[PDB]
Amino acid sequence: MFNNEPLEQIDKELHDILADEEKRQRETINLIASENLTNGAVRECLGNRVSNKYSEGYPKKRYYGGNDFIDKIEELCQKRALEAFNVSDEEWGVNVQPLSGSAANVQALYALVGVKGKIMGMHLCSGGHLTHGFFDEKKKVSITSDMFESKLYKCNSQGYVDLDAVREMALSFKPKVIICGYTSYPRDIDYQQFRQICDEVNAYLFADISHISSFVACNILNNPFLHADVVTTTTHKILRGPRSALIFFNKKRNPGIEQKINSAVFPSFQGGPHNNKIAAVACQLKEVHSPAFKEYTQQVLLNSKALAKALISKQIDLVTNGTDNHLIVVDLRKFSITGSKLQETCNAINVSLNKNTIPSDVDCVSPSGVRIGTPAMTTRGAKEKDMEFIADVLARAIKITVDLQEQYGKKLVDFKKGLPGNAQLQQLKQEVVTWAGALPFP
Amino acid sequence: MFNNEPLEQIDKELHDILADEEKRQRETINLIASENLTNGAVRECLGNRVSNKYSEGYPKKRYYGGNDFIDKIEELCQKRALEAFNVSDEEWGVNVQPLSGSAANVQALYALVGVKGKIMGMHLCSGGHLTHGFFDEKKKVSITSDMFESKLYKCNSQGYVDLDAVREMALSFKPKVIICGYTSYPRDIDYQQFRQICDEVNAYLFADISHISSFVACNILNNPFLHADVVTTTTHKILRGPRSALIFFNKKRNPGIEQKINSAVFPSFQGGPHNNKIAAVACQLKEVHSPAFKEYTQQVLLNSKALAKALISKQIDLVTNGTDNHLIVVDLRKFSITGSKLQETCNAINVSLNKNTIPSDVDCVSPSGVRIGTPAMTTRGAKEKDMEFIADVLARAIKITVDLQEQYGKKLVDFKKGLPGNAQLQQLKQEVVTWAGALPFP
Ligand SMILES: *Cc1c(COP(=O)(O)O)cnc(C)c1O
Ligand SMILES: *Cc1c(COP(=O)(O)O)cnc(C)c1O
């Protein structure tokens, strides 16, 4: 007693929009540093019947029965998680149930400090995440500043973490948790010098490596697992998994932490795990451990290096003047345009990127930069030689943005009206669509 | 630069477990009242490439661009949502982003009351959900008792919501939110009477209709939308959608509540939405509003009535001596066995049900009942005539549990040793598998 008709039949209208979205994805140069494209296998798992099953609790300790094949899956996922990140059963545990990077952070932070607890994180405009305790002056924008009492540190004017300001603010504030690892940081992190600050004040060290997880896994960047009490990471983004998250916790450094994290996730916050998510994570953490994935991660970094260099060779400025990772923040002050306007121009040419603050920005409104990243295009098979074209496309986009701003004004509302119809944009778009359209697409 | 090989090939190990789980689901009489089986179309959406896309924010008001087709999906889903539950655009709003029923309740409650806010809900052992403010004498088990100040009401010894106890507790405690709608309540709810209690205290009325959502949509049970300020429902369970949740809010009764709910979800709690979830919710809500779905919901109620009746006809006691909905709680005291034990016996015979407390249980350990429901089996095509067999199977399961208990003792560990290699159970299991196995299976 159900309708078994395929999606095309059963809901034509939704099948059409979904087909368009796929075409868009396929025909776009995607530079969103936090996006990627999952393979077909991951998507078979996300659509598996395993999500019919309710599984509140943990393996061997479920509320309900019938959970034997489910337990093997969660078990496999924890196994594959701890090894991908080169840690041992006996030092580190992992929770694979958090539904999102934001959930994992909220849960992990609750487990460590509880309500009213004190936390330190990097400011949003400076490149920290919302769930790192973000607030405005007026109101607590993130639960992490309301459930918790949070203070925010900034980066210096060169766009580097001001470790000395981290110490100044910590000693005065005495947080129980200091969060590092960011949303928009083009340089690797000094986890050791964070480990020293926490130790100095008896704080937990929290590394959110969501943006760079693959570099940590692949031994290409610094290892927070030698210094952190807790590491969180999304499974999507550069890891190229489904939409989910992982909480790692150092048993050796804090016995009794395993209980605090496992019970914070459920029953404090979540209900039943989403087992399709867990299956898909398992499926990608296998891939993550294969040496072809290390190749891919290396290709990501090469492309990023090549992208930065090509942009510099076209006299475009980058925050910190380069990158150690997959992402580049462009400083646009030189051209008297906002990242705000450039996003609009690139949207108009099937190029995906987003506005981003730069150190000199006092507010988060009308920011002076854009963030770009190479994980998605690398997945699509672009190599170092392809970065010049992307850089070329971006420079042309910056130039057209300058031309349209002089013709239509600095007012963002007014700027947009210039975009539609523009022959330069249409030609550049078609250039993009023609190159993007035919690239490998999972 | 990715692996395109199918799941069977790319990860044989996971594929075999998943295949086993599909066979378990198929060969089980599944009476878990909160479970169902999604159709293929819902599962094409869960594995759609739409989940590649980051969509922080709401339609027309996203952080990033490239979001036109995503915006059309979220808008469709909210539209199909508001009509399914027969409410007008102009009186009711919905948020389709919450990832789980539990997140919806945490997010919805935070929007209404804020940290330290006062809430009232039904106790867990009485059938209220964890996210209704559950705590123990020792621990704040759910975030909803720690983040908020919560008080828990109970049902009377007949298993009915004790409205007089609700008013009492509400006047003494003055909450800002009173939650009703439950996890394990076999009867319909008097929302008008809750609405009156909330008015005398100026509290919000919160209806979590996750278990009975389809009865509300199809106009078979009472309509909470006539009285409630806020209604939450999972999209899974009886609604038979994917794993996700909805928050409905009454604009007409509460000005400026729309932004309170929309902002608590994001950016207070969640990050990007999971667009595959929103897609799938849209696809099922289309179904919900179709006349075939009302038929199904009617078959669910018919089946429950027949199962209740056939259980009574075999001298088995039911809490409230029947049901108005999809679920029955069996009282086992008459047989001197625990729900705990019966769950084990039914596990051993491919029958899924769960232990449940009854009013006379003061412990939530070693409870005296079991909860059963008809949504999953109705989906699989069982009709009223088939409930006899299921009642017959449960009666026989109770008897074997009786026999095994006095042969092995009343201690849980001792009891379980009797299950393996018991000829009666293997025979009964065989009968179950044979009947379940050939039933229609999405
Ligand atoms: C993207 C991100 C998150 C949140 O991930 P979601 O799954 O989108 O909630 C958390 N922390 C960091 C550093 C991130 O980059
Ligand atoms: C099952 C349930 C929930 C939570 O649903 P999840 O998706 O498992 O978080 C919330 N409220 C009620 C009444 C429920 O039955």
Author numbering:
A (entry chain B), B (entry chain A): 1 to 442
Which statements did the authors publish about this structure?
SHMT is a pyridoxal-5′-phosphate (PLP)-dependent enzyme that catalyzes the interconversion of l-serine (l-Ser) and tetrahydro­folate (THF) to glycine (Gly) and methylene tetrahydrofolate (MTHF). The enzyme provides activated one-carbon units for the synthesis of dTMP, choline and amino acids. Plasmodium serine hydroxymethyltransferase (SHMT) has recently been shown to be vital for parasite growth and development, making it a potential target for antimalarial drug development. The overall structure of PvSHMT was found to be very similar to that of PfSHMT, existing as a twofold symmetric homodimer with two catalytic sites.
Furthermore, as in P. falciparum SHMT, a redox switch created from a cysteine pair (Cys125–Cys364) was observed. A previous study revealed that the THF-dependent activity of PfSHMT is regulated by the redox status of a cysteine pair. Sequence conservation (Cys125 and Cys364) and the presence of the sulfhydryl form in the PvSHMT–d-Ser–5FTHF and PvSHMT–l-Ser complexes and the disulfide in the PvSHMT–PLP structure prompted an examination of the dependence of PvSHMT activity on its redox state. Switching of enzyme activity based on the redox environment was also observed for PvSHMT.
